[PDB]
Coordinates of C-alpha atoms and ligand atoms in Angstrom, one line a residue:
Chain M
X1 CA -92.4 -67.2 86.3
X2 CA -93.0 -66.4 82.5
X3 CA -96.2 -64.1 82.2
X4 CA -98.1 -64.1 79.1
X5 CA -99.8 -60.9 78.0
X6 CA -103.1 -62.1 77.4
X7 CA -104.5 -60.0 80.2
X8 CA -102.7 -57.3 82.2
X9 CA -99.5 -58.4 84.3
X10 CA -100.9 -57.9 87.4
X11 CA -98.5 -59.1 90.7
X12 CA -98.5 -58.8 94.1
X13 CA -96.1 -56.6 95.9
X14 CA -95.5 -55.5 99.6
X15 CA -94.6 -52.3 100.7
X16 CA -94.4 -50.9 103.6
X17 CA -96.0 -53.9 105.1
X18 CA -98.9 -53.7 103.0
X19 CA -100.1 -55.8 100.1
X20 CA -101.3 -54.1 97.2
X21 CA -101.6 -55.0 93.6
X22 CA -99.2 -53.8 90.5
X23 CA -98.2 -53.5 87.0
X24 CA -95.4 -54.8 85.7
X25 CA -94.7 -52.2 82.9
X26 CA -91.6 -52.3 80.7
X27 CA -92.3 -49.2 78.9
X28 CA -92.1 -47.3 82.6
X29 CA -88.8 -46.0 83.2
X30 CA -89.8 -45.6 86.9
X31 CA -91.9 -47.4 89.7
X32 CA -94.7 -44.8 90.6
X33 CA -97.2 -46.1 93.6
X34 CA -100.5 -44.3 94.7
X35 CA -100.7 -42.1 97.6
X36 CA -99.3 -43.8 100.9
X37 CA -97.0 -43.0 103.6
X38 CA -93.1 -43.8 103.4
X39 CA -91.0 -43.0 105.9
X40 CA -87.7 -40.9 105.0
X41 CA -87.4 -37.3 102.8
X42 CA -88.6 -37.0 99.5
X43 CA -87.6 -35.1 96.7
X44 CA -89.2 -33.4 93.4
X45 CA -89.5 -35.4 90.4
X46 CA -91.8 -34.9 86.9
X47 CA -92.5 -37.9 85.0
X48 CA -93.9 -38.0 81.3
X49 CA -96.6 -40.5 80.5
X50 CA -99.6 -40.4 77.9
X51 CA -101.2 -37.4 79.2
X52 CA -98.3 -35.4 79.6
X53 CA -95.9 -34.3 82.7
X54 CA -97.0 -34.6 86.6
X55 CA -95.0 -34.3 89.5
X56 CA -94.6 -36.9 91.8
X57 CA -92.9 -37.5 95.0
X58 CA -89.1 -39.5 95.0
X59 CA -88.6 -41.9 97.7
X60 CA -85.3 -43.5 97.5
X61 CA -84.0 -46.5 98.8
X62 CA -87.5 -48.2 99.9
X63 CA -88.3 -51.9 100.5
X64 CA -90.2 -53.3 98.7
X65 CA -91.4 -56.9 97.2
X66 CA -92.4 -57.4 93.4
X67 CA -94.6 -61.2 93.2
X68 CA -92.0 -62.5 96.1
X69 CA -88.8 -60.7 94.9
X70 CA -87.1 -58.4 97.0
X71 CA -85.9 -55.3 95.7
X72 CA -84.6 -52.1 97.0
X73 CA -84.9 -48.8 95.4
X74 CA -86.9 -45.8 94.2
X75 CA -90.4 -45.6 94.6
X76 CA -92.3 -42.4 93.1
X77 CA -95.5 -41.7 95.1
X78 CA -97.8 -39.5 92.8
X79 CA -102.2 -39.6 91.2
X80 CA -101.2 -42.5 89.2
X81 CA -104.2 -44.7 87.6
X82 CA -102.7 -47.9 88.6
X83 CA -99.7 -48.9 90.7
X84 CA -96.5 -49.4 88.4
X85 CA -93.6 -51.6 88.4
X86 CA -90.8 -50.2 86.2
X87 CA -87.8 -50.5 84.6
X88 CA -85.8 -49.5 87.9
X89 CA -87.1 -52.0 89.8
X90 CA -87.8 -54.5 86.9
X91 CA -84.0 -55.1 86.7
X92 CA -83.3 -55.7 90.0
X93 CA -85.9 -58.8 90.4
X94 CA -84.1 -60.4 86.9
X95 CA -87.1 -59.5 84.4
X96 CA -86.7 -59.8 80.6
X97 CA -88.5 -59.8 77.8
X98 CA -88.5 -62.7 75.5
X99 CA -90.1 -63.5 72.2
Chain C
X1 CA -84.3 -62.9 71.3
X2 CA -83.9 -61.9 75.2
X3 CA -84.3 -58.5 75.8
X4 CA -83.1 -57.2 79.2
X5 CA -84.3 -53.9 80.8
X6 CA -81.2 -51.7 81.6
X7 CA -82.8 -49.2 78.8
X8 CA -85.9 -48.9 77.5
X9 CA -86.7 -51.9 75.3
X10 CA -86.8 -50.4 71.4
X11 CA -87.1 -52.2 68.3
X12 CA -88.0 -51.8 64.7
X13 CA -91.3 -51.7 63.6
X14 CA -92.7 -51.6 60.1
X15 CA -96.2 -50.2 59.9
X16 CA -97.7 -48.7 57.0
X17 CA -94.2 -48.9 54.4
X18 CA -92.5 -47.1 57.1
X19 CA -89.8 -48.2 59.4
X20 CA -90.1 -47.0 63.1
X21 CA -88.9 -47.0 66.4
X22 CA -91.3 -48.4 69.2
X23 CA -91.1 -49.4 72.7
X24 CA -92.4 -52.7 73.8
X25 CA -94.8 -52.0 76.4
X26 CA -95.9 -54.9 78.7
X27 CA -98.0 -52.0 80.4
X28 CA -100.0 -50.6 77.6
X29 CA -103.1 -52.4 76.7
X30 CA -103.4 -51.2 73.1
X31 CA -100.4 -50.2 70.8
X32 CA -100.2 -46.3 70.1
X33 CA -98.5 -44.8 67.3
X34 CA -97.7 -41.3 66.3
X35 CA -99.3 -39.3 64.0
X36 CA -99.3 -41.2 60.0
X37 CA -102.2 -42.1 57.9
X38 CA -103.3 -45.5 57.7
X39 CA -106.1 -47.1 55.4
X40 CA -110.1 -47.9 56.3
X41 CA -112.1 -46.9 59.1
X42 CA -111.3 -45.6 62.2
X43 CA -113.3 -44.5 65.2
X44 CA -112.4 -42.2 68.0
X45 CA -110.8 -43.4 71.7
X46 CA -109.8 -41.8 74.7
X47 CA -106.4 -43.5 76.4
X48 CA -105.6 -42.7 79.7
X49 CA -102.2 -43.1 81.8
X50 CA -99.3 -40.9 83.7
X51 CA -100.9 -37.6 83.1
X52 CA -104.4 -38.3 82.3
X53 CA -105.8 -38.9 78.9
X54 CA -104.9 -38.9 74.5
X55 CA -107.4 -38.9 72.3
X56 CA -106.4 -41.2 69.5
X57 CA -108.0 -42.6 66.3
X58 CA -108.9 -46.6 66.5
X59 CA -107.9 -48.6 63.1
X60 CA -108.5 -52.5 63.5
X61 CA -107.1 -55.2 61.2
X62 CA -103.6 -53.4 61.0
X63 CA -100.0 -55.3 60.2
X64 CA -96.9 -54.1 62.1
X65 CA -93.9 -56.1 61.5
X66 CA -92.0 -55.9 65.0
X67 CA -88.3 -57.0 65.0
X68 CA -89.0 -59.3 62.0
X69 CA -92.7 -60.8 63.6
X70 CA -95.8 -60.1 61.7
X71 CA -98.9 -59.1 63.8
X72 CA -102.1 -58.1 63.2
X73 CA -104.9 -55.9 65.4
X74 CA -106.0 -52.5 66.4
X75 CA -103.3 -49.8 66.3
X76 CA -104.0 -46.8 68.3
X77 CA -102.8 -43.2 66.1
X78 CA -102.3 -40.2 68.6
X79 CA -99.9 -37.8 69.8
X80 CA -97.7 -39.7 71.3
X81 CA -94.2 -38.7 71.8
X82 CA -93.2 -42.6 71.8
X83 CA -94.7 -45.3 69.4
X84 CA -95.2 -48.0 71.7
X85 CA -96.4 -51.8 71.1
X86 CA -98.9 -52.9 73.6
X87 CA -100.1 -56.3 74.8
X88 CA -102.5 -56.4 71.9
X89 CA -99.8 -57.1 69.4
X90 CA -97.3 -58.3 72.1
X91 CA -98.9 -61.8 72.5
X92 CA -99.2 -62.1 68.6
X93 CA -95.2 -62.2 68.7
X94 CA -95.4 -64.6 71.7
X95 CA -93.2 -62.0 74.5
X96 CA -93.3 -63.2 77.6
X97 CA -91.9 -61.4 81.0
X98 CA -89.6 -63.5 82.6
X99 CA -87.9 -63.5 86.1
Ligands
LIG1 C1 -99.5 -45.9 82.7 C2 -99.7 -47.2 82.0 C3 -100.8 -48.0 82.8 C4 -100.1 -47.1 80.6 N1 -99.2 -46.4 79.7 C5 -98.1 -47.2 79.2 C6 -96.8 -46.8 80.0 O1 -95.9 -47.9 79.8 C7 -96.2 -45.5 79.6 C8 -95.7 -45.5 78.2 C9 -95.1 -44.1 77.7 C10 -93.8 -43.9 77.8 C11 -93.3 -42.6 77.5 C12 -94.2 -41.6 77.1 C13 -95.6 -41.8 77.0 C14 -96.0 -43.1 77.4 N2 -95.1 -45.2 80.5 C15 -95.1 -44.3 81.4 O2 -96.1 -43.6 81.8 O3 -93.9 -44.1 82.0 C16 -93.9 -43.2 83.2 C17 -94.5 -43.9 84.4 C18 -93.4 -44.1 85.3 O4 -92.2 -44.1 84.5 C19 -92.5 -43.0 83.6 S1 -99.9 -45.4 78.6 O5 -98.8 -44.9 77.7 O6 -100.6 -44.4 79.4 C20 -101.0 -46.1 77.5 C21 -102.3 -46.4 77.8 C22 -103.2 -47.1 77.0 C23 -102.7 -47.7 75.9 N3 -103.6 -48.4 75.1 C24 -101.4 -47.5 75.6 C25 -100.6 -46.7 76.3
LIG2 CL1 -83.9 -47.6 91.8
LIG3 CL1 -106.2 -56.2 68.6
LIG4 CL1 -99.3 -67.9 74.5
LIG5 NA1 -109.5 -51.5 59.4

């Protein structure tokens, strides 16, 4: 698709079996989901955003489907305000930006 | 231009007589720019993200030039350590996301 930015880029994506809704966010370096289960270790990660540092958890290697496109890759599980699609995972499904 | 998302997606920005980098931010609702005076009235606003919240100071009716485009809106002045263009100025240049 091409997505306008008249409202927020909201998409569906599944992961781990479940549907929830995302942000497709180009100024995210990283994908960071709400609090759920993944299977697999984790390790320690700190992400900056507008209100400074938090830690988060690094799952690597996950499933997961962006608005039908599969992708496979790191998924940080942390209190984020809204599920985010980043650049990590932007990439692999093919997105640019165009003006 | 197409801009792909292997690094974060910087431009040029002219805002105020001064050239500056910004990120353009499909995920940010309102553009954000680091501490410089700007003319008129402003009012105070609480932003909130990765982190929790930024106070900034809201100035409407603002030109940014962005990678030769002129805009016009609300530009958000903060602490921030990025300046980043948000969807309010985004759709003004016409960007799209794309996959
Ligand atoms: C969290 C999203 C929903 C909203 N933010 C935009 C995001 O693109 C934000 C931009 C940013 C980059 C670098 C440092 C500081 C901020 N990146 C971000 O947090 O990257 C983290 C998440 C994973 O990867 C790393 S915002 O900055 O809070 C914000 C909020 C309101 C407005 N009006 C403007 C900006
Ligand atoms: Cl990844
Ligand atoms: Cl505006
Ligand atoms: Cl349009
Ligand atoms: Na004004």
């Amino acid at each position: 698709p091409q997505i306008t930015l008249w409202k927020r880029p909201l998409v569906t994506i599944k992961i781990g079996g479940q549907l929830k809704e995302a942000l497709l966010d180009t100024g995210a370096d990283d994908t960071v989901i709400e609090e759920m289960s993944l299977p697999g270790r984790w390790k320690p990660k700190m992400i900056g955003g507008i209100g400074g540092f938090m830690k988060v958890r690094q799952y690597d290697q996950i499933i997961i489907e962006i608005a039908g496109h599969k992708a496979i890759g790191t998924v940080l599980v942390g209190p984020t305000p809204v599920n985010i699609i980043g650049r990590n995972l932007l990439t692999q499904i093919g997105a640019t930006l165009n003006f």
